[PDB]
């Protein structure tokens with residue numbers, strides 16, 4: 001989130017980068033096929 | 049005299065090389081480049097905040 005919203009925390013990716021502590025881990029997106037394409041903001045655009 | 053703007057459109061079978069010419073022109077004239085996909089959008093706020 002923007003960090004001006006109440007309760008904002010960084011996106012999932014930053015947590016994985018924080019966790020693996022290397023710049024080049026092996027991210028594994030799982031189960032891409034059934035991603036939720038709704039009116040509330042389609043993540044599938046975000047993946048591009 | 050001065051610099052001037054203009055709009056243009058390209059069309060043809062996918063993968064003919066369109067975008068590649070875009071960037072090549074951008075380095076030809078020396079103007080700055082910026083891609084902006086808008087496929088499938090409905091959020092006018094994306095165009096206006």
Ligand SMILES: Nc1ncnc2c1ncn2[C@@H]1O[C@H](COP(=O)(O)OP(=O)(O)O)[C@@H](O)[C@H]1O
Pocket residue numbers: 062063064065066067068069
């Ligand atoms: N005549 C050409 N000259 C240079 N590159 C070309 C030509 N025809 C096809 N290509 C290649 O085709 C690919 C896709 O071209 P581009 O127009 O940039 O994307 P799209 O074709 O999806 O619109 C590019 O990597 C480009 O190098």
